[PDB]
Structure 1
Amino acid sequence: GLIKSLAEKEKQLLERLEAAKKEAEERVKRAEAEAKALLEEAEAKAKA
């Protein structure tokens, strides 16, 4: 039992959260962009 266990474990718990929030937003991001580009293909196709 040293304070180092929980100390240097806490500063990893924070990295695990950060990647969580990142790759949540970087996933939805893809889908929103992919929704736009799909409906452009549906306009491009539809008028032609």
Structure 2
Amino acid sequence: LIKSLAEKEKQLLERLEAAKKEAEERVKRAEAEAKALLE
């Protein structure tokens, strides 16, 4: 109830980091489609 809870909350925050990276991935594919359609 100290070390496991600290590491679990850390792992929850890491999953939130993965969600922010996949939102950045969606920004990336929006950029890719914008440049490809303009070309």
| Number of residue pairs matched by the alignment | 38
- The sequence identity of aligned pairs, in percent, is 100
How far did residue 4 of structure 1 move?
Answer: 3.0
Q: Return the alpha-carbon distance in structure 1 between the equivalents of residues 11 and 30 of structure 2.
A: 29
Return structure 1 stretches of 4+ with deviation > 6 angstroms.
none
Note the residue ranges of structure 1 that are not aligned, 5 or more in a row: 40-48
Note the residue ranges of structure 2 that are not aligned, 5 or more in a row: none
Q: Which has the larger radius of gyration?
A: 1
- Normalised to the residue count of structure 2, the TM-score between the two structures is 0.70
